Write a protein that binds this ligand. Structure first.
Ligand SMILES: Cc1cc2nc3c(=O)[nH]c(=O)nc-3n(C[C@H](O)[C@H](O)[C@H](O)COP(=O)(O)OP(=O)(O)OC[C@H]3O[C@@H](n4cnc5c(N)ncnc54)[C@H](O)[C@@H]3O)c2cc1C
Length: 433
């Protein structure tokens, strides 16, 4: 007596995957997306006459779940040739910028990274079972900064790795859970070069939006946008779903794939488990934002790290020419450090790194301000990883997915896909046993 067998909440990779699994089993399926677009924390846009990625975009064949889907839908990779860099810069907490030879810059980040992840084999022999070893559980008492303090790195090496880890945290490294970081490294074959190959090297042919829609089309599911879910209530036979318009939708089961930081917007009746409530109140620690700057000058192929007390923590050349100038792709760990949508504030901070540049224009997506992300990529705080089951657990007729709920590449498109396959299996169990 329901409108649908399955309602999937959220049109990111986790929801699109869950919808495709449910739809192909014959279940009448609906996907409700709060924004007026699909993709979630993946979003391809346009800036200065060129395509840009405001959110997630980069994949790799070491990421098993997204790669299998690419082969199901016959999508290849689109390589970002990483080239020989013209410039590598480090900006320290005090704001001083230093130019390093790219080969010595690369050597020192590898030393720091390999020292940071020296024990990945022992802690995560099975990276897709994060709590398999007691050492992983014990490490969940430490932050990343706890480890960095013991590694005896140089001032350069520490700034490099701390900027890198603050990026992965979307936060200062004293708050960043350490096992989450090692686990990702382990997922990449416990190997520096293999893991690095996954970071910003390959994109999906046809974009992330193509794969999401390839799955949703395959699913046959009904898709509705601009429909934020305000409450989910467990009532006889199914669940009852409240949009904003005081529209009411019935389903046998609901798959929630919303970002953890947005559970704040949704009333649950009855109340969810106390372990899950503790997670919703904690949230995830990323406060990242994405920004593109078009400068008049041709700066060539640049790369920069900026330490956590500075705003432009990750700078890369997206494209360059004497005609164009330079389009810089910038990721900001913490949106406290700058207002990416205030252009003069952006202009001063870019000039601190490349003095005397002229900014023609800027484009920014403040993920932490967006009510339907309120944060960026998944980043676990201290002690959160060892309780991941509490967030994964089904709650009666409510199932939970999303990249935060995956076991493997939790900071990635792939963890989102992984959670979608899990949710689809759980739907089948609930609806069919
Ligand atoms: C700046 C940034 C850069 C990134 N770069 C990479 C990369 O290079 N490589 C990689 O692998 N990963 C990257 N990621 C991470 C990747 O994008 C995410 O892990 C993945 O997209 C999350 O998928 P998801 O389905 O779990 O959540 P989401 O994509 O966030 O989808 C959840 C959906 O739920 C919607 N929603 C929220 N609340 C409601 C509500 N009340 N009602 C209805 N709908 C709601 C949201 O609008 C959203 O569409 C990046 C993330 C960010 C923020």
């Amino acid at each position: 007596g329901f409108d649908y067998d399955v309602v999937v909440v959220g049109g990111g990779f986790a929801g699109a995957t869950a919808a495709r699994e449910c739809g192909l089993q014959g279940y009448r399926t609906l996907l409700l997306e709060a924004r007026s677009r699909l993709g979630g924390r993946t979003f391809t846009s346009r800036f200065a006459g060129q395509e840009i990625e405001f959110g997630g975009a980069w994949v790799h064949w070491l990421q098993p779940h997204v790669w299998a889907e690419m082969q199901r839908y016959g999508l290849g990779v689109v390589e970002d040739p990483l080239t020989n860099l013209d410039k590598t810069l480090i900006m320290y907490n005090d704001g001083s910028v230093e130019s390093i030879s790219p080969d010595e810059f690369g050597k020192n980040i590898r030393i720091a990274f390999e020292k940071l992840c020296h024990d990945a084999w022992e802690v995560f022999p099975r990276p897709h079972e994060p709590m398999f070893t007691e050492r992983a559980r014990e490490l969940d008492k430490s932050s990343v900064l706890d480890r960095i303090k013991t590694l005896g790195l140089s001032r350069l090496q520490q700034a490099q790795i701390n900027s890198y880890m603050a990026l992965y945290a979307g936060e200062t490294t004293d708050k960043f859970g350490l096992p989450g970081v090692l686990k990702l490294f382990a997922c990449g074959g416990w190997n520096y070069d293999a893991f690095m190959d996954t970071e910003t090297h390959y994109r999906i042919q046809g974009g992330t939006i193509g794969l999401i829609n390839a799955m949703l089309t395959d699913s046959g599911a009904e898709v509705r946008m601009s429909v934020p879910v305000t409450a989910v209530e467990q009532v006889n036979g199914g669940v009852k779903i409240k949009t904003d318009d005081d529209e009411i939708i019935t389903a046998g089961v609901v798959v929630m794939t919303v970002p953890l930081n947005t559970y704040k917007h949704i009333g649950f009746t009855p109340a969810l488990s106390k372990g899950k409530q503790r997670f919703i109140k904690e949230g995830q620690l990323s406060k990242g934002a994405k920004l593109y700057v078009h400068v008049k000058q041709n700066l060539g192929r640049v790369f920069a790290f900026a330490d956590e007390q500075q705003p432009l923590n990750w700078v890369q050349t997206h494209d360059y020419s004497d005609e164009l100038g330079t389009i810089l792709s910038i990721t900001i760990a913490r949106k406290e450090t700058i207002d990416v949508n205030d252009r003069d504030a952006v202009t001063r901070e870019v000039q601190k790194m490349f003095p005397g540049v002229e900014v023609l224009g800027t484009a920014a997506y403040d993920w932490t301000a967006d009510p339907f992300s309120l944060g960026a990529w998944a980043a676990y705080g201290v002690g959160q990883l060892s309780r991941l089951k509490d967030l994964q657990a089904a709650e009666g007729r409510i199932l939970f997915a999303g990249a935060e709920t995956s076991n493997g590449w939790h900071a990635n498109i792939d963890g989102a896909v992984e959670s979608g396959l899990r949710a689809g299996r759980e739907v089948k169990q609930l609806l069919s046993l």
